Design a protein around this ligand. Structure first.
Ligand SMILES: [Mg+2]
Ligand SMILES: [Mg+2]
Ligand SMILES: [Mg+2]
Ligand SMILES: [Mg+2]
Ligand SMILES: [Mg+2]
Ligand SMILES: [Mg+2]
Ligand SMILES: [Mg+2]
Ligand SMILES: [Mg+2]
Ligand SMILES: [Mg+2]
Ligand SMILES: [Mg+2]
Ligand SMILES: [Mg+2]
Ligand SMILES: [Mg+2]
Ligand SMILES: [Mg+2]
Ligand SMILES: [Mg+2]
Ligand SMILES: [Mg+2]
Ligand SMILES: [Mg+2]
Ligand SMILES: [Mg+2]
Ligand SMILES: [Mg+2]
Ligand SMILES: [Mg+2]
Ligand SMILES: [Mg+2]
Ligand SMILES: [Mg+2]
Ligand SMILES: [Mg+2]
Ligand SMILES: [Mg+2]
Ligand SMILES: [Mg+2]
Lengths: 106, 167, 127, 183, 48, 197, 111
RNA sequence: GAAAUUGUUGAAAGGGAAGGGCAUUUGAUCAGACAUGGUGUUUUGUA
RNA sequence: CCCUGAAAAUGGAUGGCGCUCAAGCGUGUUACCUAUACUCUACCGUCAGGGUUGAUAUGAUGCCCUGACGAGUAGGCAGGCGUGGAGGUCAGUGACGAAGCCUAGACCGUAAGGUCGGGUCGAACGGCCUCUAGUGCAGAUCUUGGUGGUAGUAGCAAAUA
RNA sequence: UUGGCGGAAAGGCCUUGGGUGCUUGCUGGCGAAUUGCAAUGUCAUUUUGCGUGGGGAUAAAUCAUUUGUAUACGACUUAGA
């Protein structure tokens, strides 16, 4: 088929933060098509992969991956909190990120 | 001397672990997974391919066949956590899946000294697959368009919402 | 080869640097506490350096453990190394800097004979 | 001996130096930087054009509150001068280095200034006399100047490391499948 | 306001094209020479 | 969800549209706004004219060339209203502002693309009837914008051409609808209806 | 403080989830009837339910039974305080005072 | 033969300071663990 | 509620943008955001209450169990790091290289600091138990000595050439 | 390949003819495995250089000298085969 996508698109918005203090260990993710926590309740526990490119080849590729999970919903608009093995570099605010369908529950 | 001495040395004897009380009992797999349901592979080489479920194996895994004749997925073992169970149902009575078990699939890892960059299949696996799939396709051939359905590949489009989608 | 141990945790890998050791050269990096009345470091304002204090103490089961899993012991000649004959699993020998190369050779030979791990089996090696 | 940090072939190089030269350090530095990496005869011709105000030395670092000149356009700068004393000493050392290169048996035609440096020499102090019977320092800033000439070579080398690679089993299978479906 | 096109005459005097040179005395004086070649056909590149 | 988004500015409120576009930019969505001269500001014309004049008085005393620049073009007025909505002094802000283009009228290629509106920032859906409002182009020309006539001329031309475009489009869609109607009352249409299409 | 009349369910919840005794000036979790037997066997108290009954039915040994229990360490309420501002009287729509019987919901939230 | 200070070479950043704290990307650089005892002799210098 | 009353000096501040069935004003209901705050868990330290002389094996000032606690100038006390020299010991190190110095190389300690690798160097130095003090520096318009920016700058112009 | 239209930042839109590949509109046959129970499992564009072989064209500026419609120096204006 023309489309091979098996993930839902997301945008890294910001770290957990107050007015003056942010917490890099937790990240805020906006999922396309989700506008309420009840719908976002379906998406907890899924794996999140951030795909970026580098000039130097490490182990056979130009692509390096950040792996992370969502932990709980955030706010009334379906935003969710996500954590990763290594926190996102903070230059990815507004960058597109991948949310997969596993571990599935259906 | 340079560093004088430690007066007491720690004991060299390793201690035994305590008696663990974590017994093992079988999975309570979700009710949507019934032998004969049609599944989708979400990961691996054959990700996105619609397939048939046969048996719940002993190492908490599912026995799966394509059928290999329709789409090219052979007898393969998968995990229930990476598949989606559809409402489409295939009657799987009359097939002998009891032959397959965990030791039916062994890898025979090679020695680290022998490493090959240049580079096969077992005949018995081939003949079991050919026996089983030819029996299944006798039943898939009943319901119209389902053969083409299995030949097709699952894929999300624009506008699809999995939280609202039905499978 | 070492005695099994839990995961090694430090809670603070950064060396504690003296305040303004990066500003004036005469201020060495060795940590001194700021005893000033209006010093923001002493008053612990947000955004300043963190001071060393007992809360950062290492786990007693982990204290003095090398990443290899042994406790470092300094050795000066052959006789000292025999004090570790029955303690290979916990202590590792390290040759003192002021040991001649010829003495280092016999030290390393004896340690290899007795299976004593050596942290620096490269000092003053000619090749 | 014991020149500055150099990366050249000592067999294809000749050197000369001067110590305790009573000449302004800053002007000597700015002069030396003007001919670094230059062809030898080209550099000497440049110095000759400098002596008679045909070309100028661009002052990059020690140039606060000096004038401007149109001769700095060649170097994309506006602040340039004609430090005759430094030029004379530098060209003297250039002559010495060329003579040494000739002695070593160099072709004297592909030489370029591969290395040159100027660093401060001990001061020579005198007294200057100020108002209200006060005394101030009045000293010179001598220079140690050293330079090395070298023959220009062709392309150095190629064929770097083999760049060993480790592939996973699944990458190996992917490559095998790609080679099987293709030629 | 923006200028979109400029159409020049086929022949230019010596004195006018000297404006286009900061050193006229050492020059090939090749001003509008290929633009002159835009003429010599009726109106192809100019009338358009 | 979209590579770039083209917003038809007619009938919108400056502040609300500015907040929406700012949040979209900070989220990484590329935005371009067209027809800035039809943005509406709540309040009567003289009120906002006085507001802008009070804004004009504020300038650096000792050198007017380095004081707050008072841009007059409607697109630039919107850009200022939006720029204070974003932390523009940070690299994140600067990148965010780089994703935005604010345009007078509807220029080239963006004239051939689909325009969208923001319902929560529209005048008709946000303002109580009877309240007075302004048109940005009128205010800008009152305070020194020079190009009202040229943009009006170009928009007249663009609207004409788009009218011939839409005439052909409607004509073709009529044929499409007739053909679809003929193709209905067949089996295929019956299972499509049975399954909801 | 916010105070009111607790229910049997609430006191049972407290003694089961957060039940600690003051044994020899130490805060020992109950977790077993033997501790209560050892420390309150004098006053006819033998099990945790005996302690519960001595609490809810204020008995002759309520003083000693209550003083035996370490003060409860409660978390912040799970559902929030319910009111935007706390430090006004419950009658004024605040949090402190004698919320006479609504204290059950608040305590269950905070436990 | 140290430091202040300076020269040369190399690396890096630089829109009205620089320097610092938390976290991470990217680049550069660095250690350890990867024999274990053991079935065992498909064995040579036969233990 | 709004309006008049309502006038000051650089340009200006509901924090800014901006906001008109509001993003304003009075009031009610929820949902949500977050502090070094509260609940639980791990670890460090302190204090308190306890157990453990049995042979064999080390440290009884040792090891172990339980609970609570942890802000802090002036100030008090305690445990520690380091320097010069003395007694004793390691029959300690050392011209096959001691001390010293350099090192965005490594290890240990919360820290004072300790240890190693590499270069320079050439003649003495260390660990431990104690003794002793002219023993630990950023400030004192500190003392002596040395070196910068300013800066190739101010300037080198009376007495005719 | 034919012809139009578009100058606001046109740099695109529409259109003629023929050829070519495909077409899941419909019915068949063959292959997939071993990447071993997941590890983005690599498929986009951005610039540059070096090579090929195929076209296309053979300048100026600055210093130095000079001028004074200019000028502290720079700069500006001139002139010189
Ligand atoms: Mg310093
Ligand atoms: Mg104070
Ligand atoms: Mg100046
Ligand atoms: Mg001057
Ligand atoms: Mg004088
Ligand atoms: Mg006098
Ligand atoms: Mg909540
Ligand atoms: Mg509140
Ligand atoms: Mg000397
Ligand atoms: Mg120095
Ligand atoms: Mg500037
Ligand atoms: Mg008023
Ligand atoms: Mg607000
Ligand atoms: Mg309200
Ligand atoms: Mg928190
Ligand atoms: Mg030495
Ligand atoms: Mg250094
Ligand atoms: Mg000597
Ligand atoms: Mg003293
Ligand atoms: Mg001092
Ligand atoms: Mg002081
Ligand atoms: Mg002083
Ligand atoms: Mg002067
Ligand atoms: Mg004078």
């Amino acid at each position: 088929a023309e489309s091979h996508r098996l993930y839902v698109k997301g945008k890294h918005l910001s770290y957990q933060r107050s007015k003056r203090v942010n917490n890099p260990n937790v990240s805020l993710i906006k999922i396309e098509g989700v506008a309420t926590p009840q719908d976002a309740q379906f998406y907890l526990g899924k794996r999140i992969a951030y795909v970026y490119r580098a000039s130097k080849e490490v182990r056979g590729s130009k692509i390096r991956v950040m792996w992370g999970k969502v932990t709980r919903t955030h706010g009334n608009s379906g935003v969710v909190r996500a954590t990763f093995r290594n926190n996102l570099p903070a230059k990815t605010f507004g960058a597109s990120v991948r949310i997969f369908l596993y571990p599935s529950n259906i | 001397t340079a560093q004088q001495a430690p007066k007491w040395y720690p004991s060299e004897d390793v201690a035994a672990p305590k008696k663990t009380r974590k017994a093992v009992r079988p999975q309570k797999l979700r009710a949507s997974l019934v032998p004969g349901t049609v599944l989708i592979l979400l990961a691996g080489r054959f990700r996105g391919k619609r397939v048939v479920y046969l048996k719940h194996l002993e190492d908490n895994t599912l026995l799966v066949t394509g059928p290999f004749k329709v789409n090219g997925v052979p007898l393969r073992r998968v995990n229930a956590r990476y598949v989606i169970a559809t409402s489409t149902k295939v009657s799987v009575e009359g097939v002998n899946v009891e032959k397959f078990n965990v030791e039916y699939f062994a890898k025979e890892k090679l020695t680290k000294k022998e490493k090959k960059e240049a580079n096969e299949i077992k005949a018995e696996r081939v003949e079991d697959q050919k026996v089983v799939d030819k029996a299944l396709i006798a039943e898939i051939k009943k319901t119209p368009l389902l053969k083409q359905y299995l030949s097709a590949s699952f894929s999300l489009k624009n506008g699809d919402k999995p939280h609202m989608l039905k499978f | 080869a070492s005695l099994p141990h839990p995961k090694i945790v430090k809670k603070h890998t950064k060396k504690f640097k003296r305040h303004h050791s990066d500003r004036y050269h005469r201020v060495a990096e060795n940590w001194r506490k700021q005893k000033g009345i209006d010093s923001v470091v002493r008053r612990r304002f947000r955004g300043n350096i963190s001071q060393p204090k007992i809360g950062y103490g290492s786990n007693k089961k982990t204290k003095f453990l090398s990443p290899s899993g042994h406790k470092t012991f300094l050795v000066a000649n052959v006789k000292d190394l025999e004090t570790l004959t029955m303690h290979t699993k916990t202590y590792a020998a390290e040759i003192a800097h002021n040991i001649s190369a010829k003495n280092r050779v016999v030290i390393l030979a004896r340690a290899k004979a007795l299976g004593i791990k050596v942290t620096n089996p490269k000092g003053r090696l000619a090749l | 001996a014991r020149y500055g940090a150099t990366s050249t072939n000592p067999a294809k190089s000749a050197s000369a130096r001067g110590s305790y030269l009573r000449v302004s350090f800053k002007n000597t530095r700015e002069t030396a930087q003007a001919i670094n990496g230059w062809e030898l005869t080209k550099a000497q011709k440049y110095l000759e054009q400098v002596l008679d105000h045909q070309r100028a030395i661009p002052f990059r670092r020690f140039n606060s509150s000096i004038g401007r000149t149109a001769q700095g356009k060649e170097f994309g700068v506006t602040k340039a001068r004609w430090p005759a004393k430094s030029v004379k000493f530098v060209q003297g050392l250039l002559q010495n280095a060329a003579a040494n290169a000739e002695a070593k048996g160099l072709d004297a035609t592909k030489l370029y200034v591969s290395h040159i440096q100027v660093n401060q020499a001990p001061k020579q102090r005198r007294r200057t006399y100020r108002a209200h019977g006060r005394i101030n320092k009045y000293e010179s800033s001598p220079s140690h100047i050293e330079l090395v000439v070298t023959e220009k070579e062709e392309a150095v080398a190629k064929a770097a490391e083999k760049k060993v690679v480790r592939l996973t089993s699944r990458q190996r299978g992917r490559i095998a499948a790609q080679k099987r479906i293709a030629a | 306001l923006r200028s979109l096109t400029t159409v020049w005459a086929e022949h230019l005097s010596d004195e006018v094209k000297r404006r286009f040179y900061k050193n006229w005395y050492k020059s090939k004086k090749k001003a509008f020479t290929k633009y002159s070649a835009k003429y010599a056909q009726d109106g192809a590149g100019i009338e358009r | 969800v979209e590579p770039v988004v083209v917003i038809d500015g007619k009938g919108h409120l400056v502040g609300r549209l500015a907040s929406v576009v700012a949040k979209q930019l900070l989220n990484g969505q590329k935005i371009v706004v067209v027809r800035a001269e039809e943005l509406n500001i709540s309040g009567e014309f003289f009120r906002n004219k006085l507001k802008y004049h009070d804004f004009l008085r504020k300038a650096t005393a000792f050198n007017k060339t380095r004081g707050p620049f008072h841009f007059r073009a409607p697109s630039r007025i919107f850009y200022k209203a939006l720029r204070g909505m974003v932390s523009h002094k940070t690299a994140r802000g600067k990148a965010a502002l780089e994703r935005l283009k604010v345009f007078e009228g509807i220029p080239p290629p963006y004239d051939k693309k689909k325009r969208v509106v923001v319902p929560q920032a529209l005048r008709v859906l946000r303002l109580k009837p009877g309240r007075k409002y302004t048109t940005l182009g009128k205010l800008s020309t009152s305070v020194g914008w020079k190009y009202e006539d040229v943009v009006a001329k170009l928009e007249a031309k663009r609207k004409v051409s788009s009218a011939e475009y839409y005439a052909k489009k409607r004509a073709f869609t009529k044929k499409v609808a007739s053909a679809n109607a003929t193709a209905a009352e067949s089996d295929v249409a019956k299972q499509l209806a049975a399954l909801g299409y | 403080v916010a105070y009111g009349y607790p229910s049997y369910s609430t006191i049972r919840q407290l003694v089961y989830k957060r039940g600690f005794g003051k044994i020899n000036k130490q805060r020992v979790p109950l977790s077993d009837n033997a501790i209560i037997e050892a420390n309150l066997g004098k006053y006819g108290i033998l099990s945790i339910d005996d302690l519960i009954h001595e609490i809810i039915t204020v008995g002759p040994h309520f003083k000693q039974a209550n003083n035996f229990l370490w003060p409860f360490k409660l978390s912040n309420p799970s559902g929030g305080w319910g009111v935007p501002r706390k430090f006004k009287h419950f009658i004024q729509g605040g949090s402190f005072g004698n919320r006479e019987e609504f204290i059950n919901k608040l305590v269950k939230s905070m436990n």
